[PDB]
Amino acid sequence: MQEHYQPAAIEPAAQKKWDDARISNVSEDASKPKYYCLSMFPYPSGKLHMGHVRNYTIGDVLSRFKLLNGFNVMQPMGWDAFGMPAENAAMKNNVAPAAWTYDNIEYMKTQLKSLGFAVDWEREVATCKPEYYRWEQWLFTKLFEKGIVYRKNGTVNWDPVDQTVLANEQVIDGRGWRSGALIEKREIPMYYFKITDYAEELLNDLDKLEHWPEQVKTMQRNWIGKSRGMTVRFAVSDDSKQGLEGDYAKFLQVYTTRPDTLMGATYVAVAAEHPLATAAAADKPELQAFIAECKAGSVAEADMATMEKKGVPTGRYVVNPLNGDKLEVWIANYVLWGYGDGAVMAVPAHDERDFEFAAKYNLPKKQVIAVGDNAFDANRWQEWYGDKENGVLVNSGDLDGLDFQTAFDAVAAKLQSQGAGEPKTQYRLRDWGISRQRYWGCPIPIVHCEKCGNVPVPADQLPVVLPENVVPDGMGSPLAKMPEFYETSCPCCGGAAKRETDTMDTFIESSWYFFRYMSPKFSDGMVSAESAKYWGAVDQYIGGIEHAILHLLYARFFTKLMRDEGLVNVDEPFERLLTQGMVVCETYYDWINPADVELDGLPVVISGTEKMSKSKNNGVDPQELINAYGADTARLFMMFAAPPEQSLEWSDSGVEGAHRFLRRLWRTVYEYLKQGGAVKAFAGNQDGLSKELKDLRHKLHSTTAKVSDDYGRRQQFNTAIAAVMELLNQYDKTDTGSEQGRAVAQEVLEAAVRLLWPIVPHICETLWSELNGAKLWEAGWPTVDEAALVKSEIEVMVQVNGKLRGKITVAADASKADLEAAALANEGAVKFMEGKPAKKIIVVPGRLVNIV
Template sequence: MNYSSKELEKQWQNYWEKNRSFEPSEDFTKPKKYILSMFPFPSGRLHMGHVRNYTLSDTFARYYRQQGFNVLHPIGFDSFGMPAENAAIKNGSHPKKWTYDNIDYMRGEFKSLGFSFSKERDMATSDELYTKFEQGFIIDMYEKGLLYRKKGFLNWCPSCHTVLANEQVIDGSCWRCDNDVVKKDMNQYYFKITQYGDELLSDLSKLEGGWPKQVLTMQENWIGKSNGLEFKLRFDDKSKEKLNDKFDGFSVFTTRPDTIYGVSYAALAPEHEIVSYMIENSLLDKETIEKIKEMKNASSIDRQKEKSGVSLNLQVLHPLTKKSVPIWVANFVLMDYGSGAVMAVPAHDERDFDFAKKYDLPIKWVIKPFGGELGADKPFTDVGELFNSEMFDGMNSKDAQSKIIEYFEAQKIGKKTTNFRLKDWGVSRQRYWGAPIPFVHCHDCGIVMEKKENLPVALPEDIQITGEGNPLENHPTWKYCKCPECGKDAIRETDTMDTFVESSWYFLRFCASPKNWEKEAFSKEQIKYWMHQQGHSGVDHYIGGIEHAILHLLYARFFTKVFRDLGYLDFDEPFDKLLTQGMVLKDGAKMSKSKGNTVDPDAIIEKYGADTARLFILFAAPPTQELEWNDNTVEGAYKFIKRFFERSANVYKTDSIPAILHSKLTKEEKFARKKVYEALVRAEDVYKEKYTFNTMIAGAMEAMNALNLQSNSDVWSEGYWILTSIMEPVIPHVCWEISSQKFSFKNLAPQMVIEEVFEEESIMLGVSINGKRRCEIEVAIDASQDNILEIAKQNAHKWLEGKTIIKEIVVPKKLVNLVIKD
């Protein structure tokens, strides 16, 4: 049996496709498993990160099919978005053609790797049918008050020419192109995700044990719930007059009310409405206005580095002392957080301290260490004792927080408040290749929803992509329409939706029967079956990168809760178990074209075969850890598969697992059986909780080596029956071939562990002389102490010769120690 991966793999890939081997049954009486990978953007080529992701999900899917489960293992394509549009600009092509050509190519790659995806539920989020259903959901959300439009300072990527959500700004840069993000005053559609802030936070507890702790922590920090004091800083009379009595003050929020007596200045964001009013009404000089504009245009991350600001020459009154407090515009204050205004306490906050030092502002100390001295060169930020705080002097600063809030509420000058870091999700994008937002702008009716019977609002294909502006804005006919309300001339919304909208509900789309694929986005019957099991809800196993912890995973949780409230679902969370795989590295760095360290999966398949790629990706490292590409390990994986396949020639053809009388076997034969069943036990443990497929594969390799040390054909055939079953999810092509030739596919089913193979007939004991290990002996498991001592003395005679044994110690199943004297 000579191993030829190319011929063998193609044969089985065609067989699986012809026989619909991986289509889920619609017999809903069967136990089920829903296995899902985060689906790819159709860039045209799979990279090794994709291969790792989909090999992991495929291994789960194949294993559960063996166990008798009805398995839904679908794939789709996250096909809208800026990369397709940017590629079209670069290559002079149309985004739709570029996208769907790539999808066709990637489908071929999936087949060549033997991935057991359902083909009948395959889809792309840029399909007009998907857009139709999604636009219907958007209309429902708008009617529910969960989608709204307003003007504001938004994150703008000058390179991608579009707005970004807060979650898509990573360290001040665009998540797609890494260029600096600036602020721009624009209209934007928002999902009211903040309405679900408390529930998104509290429901993280439901995911404990199923999701990685790191992801839960990242979401908790991003939602950022904090309790504190909210109150108003009111302008003095002179400042109110200067502002033409337009404002009487502004609200601030603080988590440190214990520092209230240390407030020495207040700061506004450059975008604050008071600052805008002063600029629009020429209440500031040109130099100050220019400095404020510079702050606005700086990225969020840059605004947190070098502190800068300008004075507004306004004063507010301290809410308790009634002393004047100066007002500044500061670059570190962001409109995205709180009210865009802060009370500054430089004595007890590092950021406020740096700003005060730079601009020579007062520093008022109001907390000191217990029994210690304050240093003047840095702020004191620990828990301490209040002083210079009037009636609260001497209090523990932690205890004082609640007392000061109570005082503010009693005086009706402030209140206890909860704030969230989480802000509403801005979903408008000023690009062509996205799902159109299904609204119409009517001069008489305002913003009007398109009628559902007119959906989908599809993209026009006769456009020119230049990278300058939104092609939908300049289209000669597409945006002109009739108002769905009054029938008069109107204009379509030309913003398209953030591509994360599409990826927030695609897992539900797969819960639609192929028979009704065009009629419904998903069905309640399919949802009830695929998304529920024994007290759990959601996708059973979801696999993807941890880089989606804040973006996709948070948004999918939000959509699930919204769909529940709209009556589509009856559960709260989308994914029961989450596995976040580590990155694939080469030469110590993440694979990327710019670094020149990528590995083409097609080249690996061409040289070694898909099974080798799959085996390497699972054997080289546990799935949650980074994986370092190693050509030698790839070669080793290929050699193991070749040896595994070719040595199956020693197996005789049988329709049932051989019956073996274990007690009649030789020592080598018993050892081989033991290693085979150890591999089976290890495999069962791996799928239950550990997911350390590398240890499962190592166990199979050890069993292969043990089988090679004996020649009993029954032991060979039993061993291969079990090992082929264990390895099929990892290297399916080879295993299906062995199974078809030797076992008529009967091995692709769960096997029972036979406990007798683990029963030891003998045991190895160490022999020590005066505590120093000298040799090792093998004795029967039920040997008497006298027998053990006799064998020990025989084997250690050269160390005992001419010596007197004064003490004999036998530690059962561990060692023998003989104490001697000369």
């Protein structure tokens, strides 16, 4: 054994040993319990950095722990390869997105190999390959014929100068980002998933997820946004019917989640496009100007809560079906058209938005809810004005005195009796828009035929292959300029037709890739039946909180869709979820990378500390750290600097500390083997061992219990490492030179290197092979010796009134109440008490009990 730790030598040799043994290339082995551990797969956008590395190190730690405990572990890796990264590089470096992507994949794959993650590379997928995306095309066509995928007109941002569709994130202040031209709202046919048909299932199945962070479940619930409410119709007053045609001539319909306050309604508000607004804006140019200002604002919810809420009265009136009140209709800019009825009632006394609107225009406030004895000034708003759980109805006639749910059901009964309303469930969830007017994405498997319509491509003809020899330039979708792509024949009638040239939202690839890893070469379906049955669901998913809503909701949706298609038999894709904290790093600037600065030879300006990312160019390349210190130093530093969920500050001094600890561990094993070579590790009955060696074994086995619980239950790796460090401090303070000393030392060292192998497997593999000839992964996770934890019993003096009357043998863990009990039953005490009770019993732990 070499004296000094050389990671540049031992880390390649350890990786070759694992690769050659194929320990991470797994099959559907029924004779082994499965464990599927998944980290969110990266975009192949150029280089991984230490942030990605923390995520994948967490996943590898968990995989290697399960591997040591006998599991058949699948830890797969792949490339989320479609999307806007490569298209933007295509406009920059004037290169094809495919070539840019495959080159980043090659570079990034070697980044991962050199960190030594226990990954089944035979299961690698790249989502931009036909062998992959043909199956999301297949599922698309199967859902399209069921109506689960459908075609309908939707709104898009059309940039008239750049001649392309823009994402909302690229429309700044009404105009295009890279052009400043005023953006047009256009209606174009697009494709949607009818995810609203699964809202209740997607909401209710969250309850099954007993091992998810409650915050992630809460965010999904809020996104789905189910509400139980009440449709309510207000009769159009007789003087207010001009210009109105149809049912709009008879009533104004709204949805409320507070029908228990319908008696508190003092006006009603309609959207600018509501037929009452347009009818009242007939002879009214100011209503016309308000309606126009509305249509030119941003309906995005981000602007909505941060916008000043305005309105104009319409001179039209409707009637409250409960108390007969005539209420004016207002046009208001916060009421959205297309979101249900496009009209709301307003109860200013019990809804904050309505209170501010009514305080602006001096509209009435009518109290219908009292929360206890609380004071109500119609002038100030109070948090309890909206209290739904502790209020009771006032000024409501028949309904005086009921709580929220009772009044809700009573209003339901009264309104249905009058045909004026009915219960109704709504969701804020909208359908999922698939269409993207972009080149670098999965083609939509639809052919447009003038006689047949929108025809799905037959399964035999899938995939619809995306041509890779394309260099986009942002001048609109290149697929729409390639007749050799879009010109085709109709699959139904054989006539001339045209392919759809839009491509799919790239969230579609990440919505089922975790099933594809189960059989990434299956040619007859998305996932084979045999492998889906074996691997079941993902046991452990690790990714950042930025994907806690859309990505996770989409994946759960696809799982149900695939289950409904008969392809898998789980309801939920991910059993456990770990949301790792962000690695953050100081930035510098024209943004300069930390590895190229020092504190041209000229200085830079040192700016703030933020999430590591290419946006501010503050990603530390792991290859730089590995060349300097080794993969194990990088892994150890990540796992030790912070609990995995807390943010982690990049730190030069943290890297050095990790490296010193690995030199320490190397030194410990070398100095041990220097003093006499490997022996059989201590095992069995420890009677006869010296106190110091018993104490070292107690430390050892309690360290084994605490590490197993930190990896397995707590998933807190920093404290597991800190625990192994304490064992070595105890070790260092123990004279292990005797024959029994060497055997305990061997036991300690054999346990430490296995306990740390999930964190730093290169050094631990190497040290283990110097200690013990067996394969580390067949020796398995260290076991806890319960006897090693039993401390020694102590003898206690039993005094009756201060005079010694006996002795008791008591356990080292014994409480004051056990001592009191054992003392009271001692034959010598019981005799010298003469049936008299105790006035007091003084317990001195470890020394004496004195009965008064």
